[PDB]
Each structure stands twice: as structure tokens, then as C-alpha cells.
């Protein structure tokens, strides 16, 4: 089998991208924020506290005829952005662009802090990350990839991101025309239950590539792209005006100014972030100060590959016995 999604900006600065996902019998259609970073299915639905859904979709449960409790089982999460959501847990039919998984996962909302309620165009998560993360208890639950694995004709799923426009997740097969040249593999450690590999360097703009191993994880979950100090710093130095904010909560730079290109290294091969794809916008509606799409990792405790890096590549995340990711330019 395979099944083959379109993926669209949640907004004009691509700051997320919703997938449409058919949950339950019959189908009710959620657009969900697909997260390479995490492990957990949930949704907005019916038993979501009510003051805390404001536009969402919700998923109900008691209209579908497949949904059965999963007894007992609770779930909560919580995110880098302080963010999170917690609630109970149903088994249910989903299916992503035509791929169908009986018996998933889906983790219903109770509860969901205020960034979830305050943007009307996610309606819940699917994780894409291992399912070791996945925080159902009593009984960890696994994946949507996980559970289509053994049915998709080749155990991999691929992530094709527009800058400023939609793209696409297919699951179970390489689609050759989505990419130019060649797709560069490099090794994957699951060991913190990401797709966490290392990258062999960066260049800034039209200089020289510097020869250095930067490990981080492939997170379409994360907007940004967030490295070393060093490399964030040799980045914004090359941009006038550029500087860190602490009252911001980051990188600023004139919204005047034309941003230089950032290149990173996959194995011998190279990814070139286009300057336009840095730049996150005014600060505040009216600001000239505009906001970085590169910034520290200090303090994360890991470099993050987000969606400014991802979405310059055709992204596969090949789920064989020993996983590995490919990277190609498009
Ligand atoms: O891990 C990500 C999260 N990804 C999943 C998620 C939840 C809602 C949408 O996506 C979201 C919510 O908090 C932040 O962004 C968090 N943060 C991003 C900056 C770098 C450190 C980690
Ligand atoms: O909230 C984000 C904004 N998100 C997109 C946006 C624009 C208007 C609404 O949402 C953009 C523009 O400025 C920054 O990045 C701002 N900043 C991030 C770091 C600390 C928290 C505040």
C-alpha cells in the first residue's frame, strides 16, 4: 500500500502545515500538524473542555461507528514551547491520503493550554517520531507510520515542504520526479527516540563550507532551524543590523535587509537554504524589526533541522530495520 497528502501553510510565514487526516466511520476530517519531533496522535474533540476550543475541528467519538475506548488509558504531553494537551484514548479507523490503518491510536483531548486554542487552524498532532516517545498510559501506543509500516510497499515516508506554498507526505514510496539529483542517506540514531543524525557542516551565504559535525533531528514539527551559538552568530554577523534579542526572544534583523543563503552538509552533499526562507516577518504588525528563521539551540539541549531547513529538501525518513534519512535538493 501507499497514500499520498497534501501539506499546506497554516499561514504566509509557513510558521506550521496541516495535512488532512480521515479519522472514523464515517470519515470526519481533521487537519492535522504532522511532527517528525513527537510520537502521539491527538485531536481536538468532543470532550475537549469548551472554553478551550475556539475554530478547531473536533473529532466525536460517539459518531463513529469503529471507535472503541481504549480502557484506561490516558495520555499528556508537553512541548518545547511550553505548550500542552492531555486527555483519554480511542482505537479508530484513520486514514492519510488514501492509506488506511485499522486500530490507531487516537488521543483525544481533554485539555489543551492556550497556544492550541488560539490557532483555529491545527486540530490536534500525528507524531512521526519513534513510537518510544509515544506517551499513552499504561500501554505505549505506537505511530500511524509505525502500524502502516508492514503494509506500505517499501517501510519509508517522505516530506516534501513548500516555502510559501503546499507540498507533500507520501508514505511507502519514493517518488522520483519530487526531487533533483541524487538523495544523499545518512545514518539515524534512535536512541533519544528522534530521527537525530549528523550533519557535516554549514556554509554562510557564498562562503567557504566549514567542515564540522552538527547532530540534530529532522523535526517537521519546529518552524525554525536552530543550531550552535557559533553558527548562528556567524549567520546573523554576515546580515547589517542583525542582533539577539533577549525581549524578543531571539535573532532580529532589519526587515530592509536581503538575507544571504544558508548551506547545510548531508554526508558529502549539500542543502541550500535560499535567504527568502530566513525570513520570518515583523516582529509585531508595523515593526521594521523582522524575525530570524535561524536561531540558538543554546538552552534547547538539541539542534533542531525544522521546517526552514527541511522545506529546501526532499526529506525521506526510511524506516527500514536500521533506520536512516535521505536528503535531496528539488
Ligand atoms: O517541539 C516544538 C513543538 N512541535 C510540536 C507542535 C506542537 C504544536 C505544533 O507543533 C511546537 C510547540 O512548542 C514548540 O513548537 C517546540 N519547540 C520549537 C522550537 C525549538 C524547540 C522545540
Ligand atoms: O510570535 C513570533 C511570530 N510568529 C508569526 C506571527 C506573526 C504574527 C503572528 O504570528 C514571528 C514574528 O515575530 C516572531 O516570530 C514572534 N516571536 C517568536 C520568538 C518569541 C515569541 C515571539
Known sequence: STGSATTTPIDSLDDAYITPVQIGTPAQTLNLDFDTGSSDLWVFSSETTASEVDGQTIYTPSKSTTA??????????????????SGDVYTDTVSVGGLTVTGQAVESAKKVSSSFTEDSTIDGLLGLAF??????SPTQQKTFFDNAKASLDSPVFTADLGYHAPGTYN???????????????????????????TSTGYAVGSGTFKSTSIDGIADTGTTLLYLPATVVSAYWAQ????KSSSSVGGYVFPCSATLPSFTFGVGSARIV?????????????????????IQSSAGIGINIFGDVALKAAFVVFNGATTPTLGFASK
Open 171 to 197: 508514505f511507502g514510496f519514493i517518488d522520483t520526479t519530487a526531487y533533483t539529483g541524487s538523495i544523499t542517506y545518512t545514518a539515524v540514531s534512535t536512541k533519544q527516540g528522534f530521527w537525530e543524525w
Open 239 to 242: 546580515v547589517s543590523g542583525a
Open 131 to 136: 513510537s518510544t516517545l509515544n506517551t499513552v
Open 68 to 85: 472503541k475506548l481504549l480502557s484506561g488509558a490516558t495520555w499528556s504531553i508537553s512541548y518545547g514551547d511550553g505548550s500542552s494537551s
Open 273 to 293: 537554504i535560499p535567504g527568502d526562507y530566513i525570513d520570518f516577518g515583523p516582529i509585531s504588525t508595523g515593526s521594521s524589526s523582522c524575525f530570524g528563521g
